[PDB]
Design a protein around this ligand. Structure first.
Ligand SMILES: CC(=O)N1C[C@H](C)Oc2c(F)cccc21
Ligand SMILES: CC(=O)N1C[C@H](C)Oc2c(F)cccc21
Lengths: 412, 412
């Protein structure tokens, strides 16, 4: 029968820091992690900035000879995963290794590596493709390499649900534990899509902000002057653990994962419906799953991408689900500061939602200078808001009409 | 307690055929789908052959306009999915659409689109990248497009576990139904990694057969002269359905899905442990999940990739799990005929496992001319074997050490 699931460990690389505390300090201070991209020449591109991980040292985690064969999305995913496992205090033994698994996802995975090998193929030939091309690039290898390094023999898989990946990964991992398929899961996501194909591809779709001359002000969810999302890199990982398992070993419990919702829009390959009907169905599924009155919700970490259609669909969904309570909860987009980490967005934002619960503070939506028509909720404009938070919701929506909602609450 | 899950619809593209019954006729006749790859200059490549889909007509499924937006692997995934839904007879309505979901996956995703867009980027610059590059290449777009086309509002997601993708997709969709998150799921996988990048990337690892002179004899699981796997393209999809839901509408039931197991080797990035310890744990987990004793298994559809280490690990795992029953079951690799469809392997092989139950026949392992040291099981060498089959397993053992096993049983 269905078991309870708590969060005992968290790990992060973000545009705001190389761990969780440094990232959360930036969040509460309203700091932007967005800047012109330094790692490649983008003069031919319509967008030349994003949220890079700054000063990442993979040799804090892995030998250079290994790191050299792994795409950055794997390196980031492993770094966050190692942080989360160390943060949990869990010791992997012969007695528990079959009961610990991993579900770390990505939207696009090792596009940098694939692009670089495609260049070798076209300019030189197939004789110059890296022997590590497949295991160093494909999405399931965060889960794979983490299991090899820590000895995890439980369920080993990866989700790829575009911008919903991190949320689905955590929710599905929580169901594994709930249903008895595992006692512990490391779950979240990682992304590094800032290569020519990624920036060029999102650029060709005209999905990105082109605020090149003022990158820190580009991501402005629900602001009338928003012009699309800001591409960002990094990783979030959480250690999810069955409650009695956590209690038995005296684990520090950050919060309880009480609800998970999924739904499909069945509307459009890339556009969200204006009424946010799929997002509403998803949140209602999650609140029913959590056994909650919707009035219990204190804080929503929105998807809040800074796209024209996405931001207004989320206001419409929150008003539909919460009615008059929509005006009492606080909702913010931390993508205002981090930008959009794509398949990692739901992972870092689950962590921010747990820290909102730990610290009793709603992170700000920076850059919300002029809220757009209908954007008249408490969106925590500009400055962090200390407040009572017993229940926090994290929402994600993605290409394919794919929706995910996580519901966290304080654990006594 | 848990609901029962049956198979009510199947769909396929393979190197043997453009649907299930054509592919299966090929399988029982011992026909190879392997041939030199056409319309590519593979001069510089060490492998020039594979399993292509022959004569695929996407306009049976999609408008020319929607087809131009989607990678081949997505086209193949949608063809299998549409076939499976038609085969099921299911009518989607306002009363059930929130209870019907999709989990169609891929191991490597859109390498053909990535190649073509790299060509544009490198030749002409980023402003020639296709506007539909990202949404037309990402792995969750089979689930995405299918949900939009058929109006499916249930759980919408995509797995990517390398060569285990199709097995995991089917198993996790079965869990969704068994635990009441959906009543119907479309599940499986699709792959198109011919392309220069697949043949080049697997070739760089020296993982492929290089038997260019005799492509149909290349894939020879457990044969002492095997020299690696054969890359193949296509798709498999099943309609999974809660039993009472199937009975109420008078569905034709092919078989029951009674067990699903997962494990991680936690061993190596691409090679299994010599004794297949992880594969043994996975099969034991799947049998425990079905409440079956190993003695009850009649037929195993092996992973059987034709890699020297993989094939011998499976023999050890099966001997380990089945003890004095290990010679009584029949185990065959249909990859001997189809080659290795990577993330679609487990999807087409689940279908072959269901059809073994329907038709009471073990498909052959073709090319098994000289079984290797210790390969002394009933590997159904050369010719199909009519036999009693009540319980059929399908195994996938993929990169990152990620394992899946499905257990099917006759339904009456
Ligand atoms: C875990 C793994 O696969 N390792 C770790 C091992 C210590 O070294 C490596 C290497 F040199 C090159 C590539 C990978 C690895
Ligand atoms: C030592 C080092 O730089 N770090 C930083 C990070 C906050 O935690 C770590 C970890 F959990 C596992 C391995 C390394 C590190």
């Amino acid at each position: 029968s269905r078991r309870r699931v708590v969060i005992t460990g968290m790990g992060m690389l973000s545009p705001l820091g190389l761990d969780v505390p440094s990232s959360w300090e930036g969040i509460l201070a309203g700091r932007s992690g967005i800047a012109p991209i330094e790692h490649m020449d983008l003069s031919a591109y319509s967008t030349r900035f994003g949220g890079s991980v700054k000063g990442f040292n993979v040799e804090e985690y892995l030998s250079a000879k290994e790191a050299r064969k792994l795409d950055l999305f794997i390196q980031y995913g492993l770094a966050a995963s190692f942080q989360a496992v160390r943060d949990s205090g869990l010791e992997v033994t012969d007695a528990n290794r079959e009961r610990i698994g991993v579900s770390m996802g990505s939207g696009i995975g090792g596009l940098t590596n694939i692009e670089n090998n495609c260049r070798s193929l076209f300019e030189q030939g197939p004789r110059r493709i890296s022997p590590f091309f497949v295991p160093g690039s494909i999405i399931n290898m965060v889960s794979g390499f983490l299991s090899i390094h820590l000895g995890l023999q439980g369920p080993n898989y990866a989700l790829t649900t575009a911008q919903t990946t991190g949320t689905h990964s955590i929710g599905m991992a929580a169901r594994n534990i709930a249903y008895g398929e595992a006692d512990v899961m490391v779950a979240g996501g990682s992304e590094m899509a800032a290569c020519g194909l990624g920036l060029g591809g999102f650029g060709a779709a005209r999905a990105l902000s082109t605020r090149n001359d003022e990158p820190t002000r580009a991501s402005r969810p629900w602001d009338r002057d928003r012009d699309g999302f800001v591409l960002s890199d990094g990783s979030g990982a959480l250690v999810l653990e069955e409650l009695e398992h956590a209690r038995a070993r005296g684990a520090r419990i950050y919060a309880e994962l009480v609800g998970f919702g999924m739904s499909g829009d069945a509307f459009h390959m890339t556009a969200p419906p204006e009424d946010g009907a799929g997002a509403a169905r998803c949140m209602k599924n999650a609140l029913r799953d959590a056994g909650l009155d919707p009035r219990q919700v204190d804080y929503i970490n929105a998807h809040g991408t800074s796209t024209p259609a996405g931001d207004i669909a989320e206001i419409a969904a929150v008003k539909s689900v919460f009615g008059e309570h929509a005006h009492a909860l606080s909702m913010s987009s931390t993508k205002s500061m981090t930008g959009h980490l794509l398949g990692a967005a739901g992972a870092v934002e689950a962590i921010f939602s747990v820290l909102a619960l730990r610290d009793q503070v709603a992170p700000p939506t920076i850059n919300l200078d002029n809220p757009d028509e209908g954007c008249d909720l408490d969106l925590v404009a500009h400055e962090a808001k200390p407040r009572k938070i017993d229940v926090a919701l994290s929402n994600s929506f993605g290409f394919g009409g794919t929706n995910g909602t996580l519901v966290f609450r304080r654990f006594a």
